[PDB]
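Thread: Modeling a multi-component assembly for a lab meeting

Hi all, long-time lurker, first post. My supervisor asked me to bring a structural picture of a complex we are working on to next week's group meeting, and I have zero experience with this. I have the sequence lines for every component (209 residues in total). Could someone generate the structure of the whole assembly? Inputs are pasted exactly as I received them:
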Amino acid sequence: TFGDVQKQIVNYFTYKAVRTVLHQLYEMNPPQYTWFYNHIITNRPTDGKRFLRALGKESQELAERVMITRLHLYGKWIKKADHGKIYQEISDENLALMRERLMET
Amino acid sequence: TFGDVQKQIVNYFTYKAVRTVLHQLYEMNPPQYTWFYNHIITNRPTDGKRFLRALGKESQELAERVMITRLHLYGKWIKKADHGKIYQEISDENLALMRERLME
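Re: Modeling a multi-component assembly
Sure thing. I ran the full set together rather than chain by chain. Output:
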């Protein structure tokens, strides 16, 4: 069961797309940056689908921008991701944490 | 790039590993279950590495079980994960959401 994993990853990319959009507004549209920032306080980019649904009810344009961005970002990641390398880096990190233990000796 | 994505994925498998070990302890080792539950109240499984360092200072056996379990879970995941499928699904969900607003 890795349904939880797929969901958490989509949540994270939704989150990352929110930050990307806020960064664009900060530079290019300061009144909307303020609006969106304030919106996010009460509607947290936690669960991606719930977040997007509530955002959409107040601003379809910002919801669509987050949607497009999250999908684009996910597409760029998977073209690049080396999962075998990540597995190896976990194994490397496990062994490194064990070594730290010997140091406290 | 996307190093943040890697770090988060690793955090999440670490957390899923913690949950897996808790579930083992729940029936098979009640004294250790209550110990680990209480430990986690003040050492949260959010940054995996930091969580493991702190856990290791008090119980290297639990840290090791979480390390092995996170790695094996990641292994099982990558063997079947279909990332093209996930992409298609994010897209479909985007469309569904947009259609909810057309209705409303």
